[model samples]
Target: GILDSMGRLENLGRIQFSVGYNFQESTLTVKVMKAQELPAKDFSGTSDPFVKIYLLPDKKHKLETKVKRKNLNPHWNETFLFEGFPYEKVVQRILYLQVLDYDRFSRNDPIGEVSIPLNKVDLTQMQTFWKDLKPCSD
Candidate 1:
């Protein structure tokens, strides 16, 4: 439970989001919600947060969303759709999510990351998830 409380113990914020699929369009959609109590990565111990997405071994075909201003808990009402989605290939790969701290003056920093296999996502209905990030120190 220590990790649940905004990682008050640290930056162990749980990433919450939703995933859905379109059978007719062969598209995959994502809705990035809020990540609570993330570890602070900025000079002020606060972070400008954003999320990057990748489909398995092919890092070349990747996508990410815009950054949310300084926030320990970021709520993104953004929606992403990937068309002509390859279900067969992706099911064999991983759904990788990298949570980063946006820094305009310097290189962006990583807050934490989570990886899920496509097989884990049920296409029949929208699946809501809350996954925890690894320790910020790592």
Candidate 2:
């Protein structure tokens, strides 16, 4: 997604990165491959991971944008099936992941970030970029 005059990509919507309370079995699953080096043990404290989606309403106009919807436990490596998405209206979009760690002193402090470009073409390419180095899982 192209940056606006303020150098900020328009907000698509918050990406839900955690399992939802009402999620049905197999409805959403995030498989953290052994290579990803995700926490081997269960986290003792609260760690919220979420993704933000941004969309450009008009490809011809760089500024036209909107936030699609915030989904929890969205399928990352897998195909994301939505109930009603206005595909014809969105020309481009971007996905950003934000992780917050809860500290004894504070709440929801950012601990990680990731960005993904979601143009009409690249959206189908299935590429993801991590802002921070991921652990090598083997």
Candidate 3:
């Protein structure tokens, strides 16, 4: 792990994504674009990775994407839609994405994570972000 300008230890991967909310449909859409420079977790110096997504404060509902095998950079292009959330509810949500390495016979190791507060963004139009992965709170 490298140190940021603040001299804090941070993870080494970055991920791209876009988020938008549809007023008419009262639906929120999150598009997981791709990931880069991910940490390797396998003996082959590669990882089988996937993302676990959650709308904060509502862990009961979870969403995920398919695993990409033997790769450091994976392009998911996967979109998740959350229906029934009005503008008020959407603004109160936090988008949490967890990246983990999928192990066949053991525990899935977490690589890093990204948390985005919906209220901080202008959801009227789609917002795209490229964020560096941060250490998991766990």
Better of 2 and 3 by TM-score: 3
Alpha carbon lDDT of each predicted model? 0.80, 0.30, 0.91
lDDT of 3 by residue, 22-72 (tens): 999999999998999999988889999899999898988889989999988
Error of 2 at 122 (Å): 3.9
Clash totals for all candidate models: 2, 8, 0
Best lDDT goes to which candidate?
Answer: 3
What are the models' TM-scores? 0.84, 0.35, 0.92
Stretches of candidate 1 above 4 Å error? Answer: 1-10, 135-138
What order do candidates take by TM-score, descending? 3, 1, 2
Q: Which candidate is the best by TM-score?
A: 3
Worst 10 residues of 1 by lDDT: 2-11
Model 2 stretches astray by more than 4 angstroms: 1-81, 124-138
Q: Which candidate model has the greater lDDT, 2 or 3? A: 3
Candidate 3, run of 10 with poorest lDDT: 3-12
| Cα shift from native, residue 31, model 3 (Å) | 0.3
How many residue pairs of model 2 clash at the backbone? 8
